[PDB]
Amino acid sequence: MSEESQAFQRQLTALIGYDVTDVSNVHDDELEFTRRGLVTPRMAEVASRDPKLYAMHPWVTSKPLPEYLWKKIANNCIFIVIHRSTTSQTIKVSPDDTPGAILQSFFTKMAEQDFVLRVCGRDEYLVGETPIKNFQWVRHCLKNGEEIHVVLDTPPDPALDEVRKEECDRKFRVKIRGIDIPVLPRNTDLTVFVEANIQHGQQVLCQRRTSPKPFTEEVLWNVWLEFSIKIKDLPKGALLNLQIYCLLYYVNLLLIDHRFLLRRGEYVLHMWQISGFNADKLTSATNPDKENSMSISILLDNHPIEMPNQLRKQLEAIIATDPLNPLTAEDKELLWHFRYESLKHPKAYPKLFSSVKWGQQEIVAKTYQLLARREVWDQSALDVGLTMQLLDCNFSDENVRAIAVQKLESLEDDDVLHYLLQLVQAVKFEPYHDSALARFLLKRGLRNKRIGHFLFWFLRSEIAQSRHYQQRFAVILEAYLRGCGTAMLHDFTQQVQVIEMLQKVTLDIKSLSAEKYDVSSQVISQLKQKLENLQNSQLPESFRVPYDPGLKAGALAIEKCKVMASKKKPLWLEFKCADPTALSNETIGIIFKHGDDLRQDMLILQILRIMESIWETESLDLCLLPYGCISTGDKIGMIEIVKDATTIAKIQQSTVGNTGAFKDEVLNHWLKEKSPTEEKFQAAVERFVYSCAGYCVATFVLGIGDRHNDNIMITETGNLFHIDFGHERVPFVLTPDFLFVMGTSGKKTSPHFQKFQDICVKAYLALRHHTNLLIILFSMMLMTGMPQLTSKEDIEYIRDALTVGKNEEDAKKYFLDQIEVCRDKGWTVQFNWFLHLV
């Protein structure tokens, strides 16, 4: 192994944020085994991909152009403006024309083909045999009444993507020797015992406890715990979960390893402490802090492997229930007995597999037999909600999860991007490091630069702040980095250097000030100085914007930089675009913040993006504005600065605003004053109506509707939008001023208001057609992103919000009433936010 390669592993370690060659925290070889196992999948995808399309990563879709976008094209023509150094002729185009085709209606239309079309000021290319209406940039330009500006240039050299070459029927039992913790001191000396559970898909097959003993820094039971389950009956993927009750600490050990061998021998496991139901409780990793943590020693000495009319009605009823409906023992017995009928309803699959007795070898075998004749499933139309249901904490069986991944195989790149964060979060529910899901993400990321970019940041986000999963995600990220190509690698290196520098600055400045005071010139002077120093050497000529990889940021515009006045003291940075072909002088705004887990915001924003695509599948545009947000490290990251935007509170505050008085007409005035004409003003009011509806609906369903005015913004162009998603009542925010813009006051009516209620209802029922998708996303969001959330009651909110079980009439009713409540409450809740502080 050349000294060069060691230097390389060193480089990867600095991009990843973890050393995957570190063996300090392992009790076996699963991780190393996996690093090797992933070599094959990587090399296969790298060698399979087309160098040209890979270099230009065109962003395309197979979905049809929505109705609301055809409206802007009634002439069946689209104008593309090509530029190549001075003047620029604007080619008339047909929504069906191909990039190579408009190149024909050009050269000859003018009068050597080794050239390509690139969006101006972006690393974005319109290539491949795809209709121009199928390009995301084209649809983005239409939805925004913007012109499509392109530049003629030379295709990127695929050479630049070169990848470096690589080179017994007995019952199961376990002995609990004892537990050891360096220092126990809490308050009153209590007693302690160990609870050992055998689980599979978060289902306890068998449970045993030790006798209670006095809780001292070392407790020695030396006791055998014999379980009712036979060794032969242990399903692969089953965990021996060990817990300390006083619940203080937990830890897990996979009973059967990555080689199909029964675990055996002595183990001293460092446990995780509960912070006084969630994915962290399922980890096979042990606490990396060996110095201050509880440990438990154990010994293992135990290689393997026609329906009557009315009953059919019961079965179908069971199948129609929602993902969260509990399955009764009767239900499970039915689903199982009628196994073969059940297998004819893809939607029954999750309910059916939750009906399997996983602690019985014979039954599991019958199950694989069931999966053998999978014809109905394989030919079923892809249902993302259904596929995700089989990837959650409820299924630990490799094969069951594999058919889910099989269905994902059929997703187009545009959809993978929509679900990526949730798939990645779903890797936490995998019992082994090497899994079909992990390999699928690897594969899709290496196949496409955009998915790879995001995959990188999403993995890095978790590696930096999750002790429970950093090891696994690190192995996966490394596998990806070893295949993305030198170009991407150089880019990631730049992005990481930049954010690392800015992290230093952010922290230092937060120190030079109190917690809550204000922002003085001492602190601002210090900022501009520190930045001035970086601009010289430290901060690279350019770098890709992490939440918008097609955008290249150049030098900082130091005169415009500053520290924002908020509890936390985040930086307000602005950069020049490093692309001369850019169509404007507008800088690139980025907010840098330390002290908050931006992962929750990423999660919400991403679900918001999903809600948009769902509404798109229905021909609806609610004008949401899910700005870029990326967790880059522990409690720190970057956020996109939406241009020409203010807080609804700030609009209020600039006018008197003593103690938080509130006037209904302020908003309308602000909008009228920022509009150059009445035309632009009407457009602003309309957009406000649409965006208000979208955020009201989205926010009610996700159960985040009750927000303070300071957490909601609006663009000068009328787009309302929510922010700061980090962790008496009202369902959402629709205050009298919003109402005022709608032409109503004092519980009255109006054309825009009526239009609003219509949009809300259309939006709401449009989501109910996706009820399962939303429910499964909501619960995965809770399990992998929040603290220890009740696997029932917290999650049940969404079932109620989507009013599952009701017909259309009762739903509309429920929401309209919801709209009335905000009205009756007026300014009440908003007003309350100020007093709680006094």
Name the residues that contact ligand FAZ, by CB under 6 A.
Answer: 564, 566, 570, 591, 593, 627, 639-642, 645-646, 723-724
Say how far apart CA 710 and CA 718 lie, in whole Å.
17
H or E stretch covering 362: helix 361-372
Q: How far is the CB of 453 from ligand FAZ (least distance, A)?
A: 21
Write b or e for each residue in 543-563: b if 16 or more Cβ atoms lie within 10 A of its Cβ, otherwise e.
bbbbbbbbbbbbebebeebbb
Closest distance to ligand FAZ from the beta carbon of 179 (Å): 42
For residues 548 and 724, which CB has a smaller minimum distance to ligand FAZ in the complex? 724
Q: Give min distance, CB of 646 to ligand FAZ, in A.
A: 6
288 carries a ligand binding annotation:
no
CA distance 236 to 828: 56
Cβ closer to ligand FAZ: 37 or 595?
Answer: 595
CB of 517 to ligand FAZ, least distance (A): 16
Distances, alpha carbon 409 to alpha carbons 2, 350, 403, in Å? 37, 19, 10
Give the Cβ contact number of residue 183 at 10 Å: 7
Nearer to ligand FAZ, 373 or 643 (CB): 643
Closer residue to ligand FAZ (CB): 367 or 606: 606
Task: Please report, as a single letter, which amino acid is at residue 479.
Answer: A
Quick one: 725 or 764, whose CB is closer to ligand FAZ?
725
Residue 564 beta carbon to ligand FAZ: minimum distance, rounded to whole angstroms: 5
For the CB of residue 630, give the shortest distance to ligand FAZ in the complex, in Å: 12
CB 79 within 8 A of CB 90: yes
∠ at Cα 619 (387, 621), nearest 5°?
100
What token pair was written down for 347?
Answer: 């939607």
Contact indicator for 782, 794 with CB cutoff of 8 Å: yes
CA 597-598-601 angle, 5° bins: 125
- Confirm or deny that 718 is annotated as ligand binding: no
Q: Which is nearer to ligand FAZ, 691 or 779 (CB)?
A: 691
**415 marked ligand binding residue:** no
Cα three-residue angle 247-251-255, rounded to 5 degrees: 130
- The nearest distance, CB 644 to ligand FAZ, in angstroms, is 8
Least distance from ligand FAZ to the Cβ atom of residue 722, Å? 9
Cβ atoms within 10 Å of 306's Cβ, excluding its own: 5
Task: Indicate the residue among 392 and 640 with the shorter CB distance to ligand FAZ.
Answer: 640
DSSP three-state, residue 714: strand
Is the CB of 101 or the CB of 591 nearer to ligand FAZ?
Answer: 591
Q: Is 227 annotated as a binding residue?
A: no
Single-letter amino acid, residue 712 = I
Please identify, using beta-carbon distances, which residue of 518 and 541 lies nearer to ligand FAZ.
518
Q: What is the DSSP string of 268-318?
A: EEEPEEP----GGGG-----S--SSS-EEEEEE--------HHHHHHHHHH
Minimum CB separation of residue 710 from ligand FAZ in Å reads: 8
**Cα separation, 69 vs 144, whole angstroms:** 10
* Residue 774 near residue 723 (C-beta atoms within 8 A): no
CA angle 798, 704, 777 (to 5 degrees): 45
- Would you say 589 is a known binding-site residue? yes
CB of 470 within 8 A of CB of 463?
A: yes
Residue type, 569: K
Residue 597 is labelled as binding a ligand: yes
Secondary structure element (H or E) that encloses residue 630, with its range: strand 629-633
CB of 704 to ligand FAZ, least distance (A): 13
Tell the smallest beta-carbon distance from residue 570 to ligand FAZ (Å).
Answer: 5
Closer of 32 and 724 to ligand FAZ (Cβ) = 724
Which residues does a chain break follow in the chain (C to N more than 2.5 Å)? 111, 167, 246, 276, 302, 305, 727
DSSP sequence for 444-498: HHHH-HHHHHHHHHHHHHHHHH-TTTHHHHHHHHHHHHTTS-HHHHHHHHHHHHH
Question: Is 73 annotated as belonging to a binding site?
Answer: no
Strand 213-214 to strand 239-245: parallel, antiparallel, or no bridges (unpaired)?
unpaired
> Is residue 657 part of an annotated ligand binding site?
no
Q: Which residue is nearest to ligand FAZ (CB)?
A: 724
Q: Does residue 630 have a known ligand-binding role?
A: yes
Q: Any known ligand binding at 631? A: yes
721 known ligand binder: yes
**Tokens representing residue 188 in the block:** 């009153």
Choose between 31 and 666: whose C-beta lies nearer to ligand FAZ: 666
Q: Are the beta carbons of 773 and 384 closer than 8 angstroms?
A: yes
From the CB of 587, what's the least distance to ligand FAZ, in Å? 13
Helices of type H across 617-665? 648-653
- Asked whether residue 737 is marked as a ligand-binding residue, the answer is no
628 is in an annotated binding site: yes
> Is 591 annotated in some ligand binding site?
yes
* Residue 595, annotated as binding a ligand: yes
Check the annotation: does 726 bind a ligand. yes
For the CB of residue 471, give the shortest distance to ligand FAZ in the complex, in Å. 30
| For ligand FAZ, the closer CB: 151 or 639 | 639
Is residue 401 within 8 A of residue 365, CB to CB? The reply is no
The DSSP symbol for 76 reads: S
CB 573 to ligand FAZ: min, Å = 12
Q: Answer yes or no: is 831 a known binding residue.
A: no
Residue placing its CB nearer to ligand FAZ in the complex, 98 or 711: 711
Residue with smaller CB distance to ligand FAZ, 160 or 565: 565
Residue 625 annotated as binding? Answer: yes
Known binding residues are: 589-598, 624-632, 721-727
Known binding residues for ATP are: 589-598, 624-632, 721-727
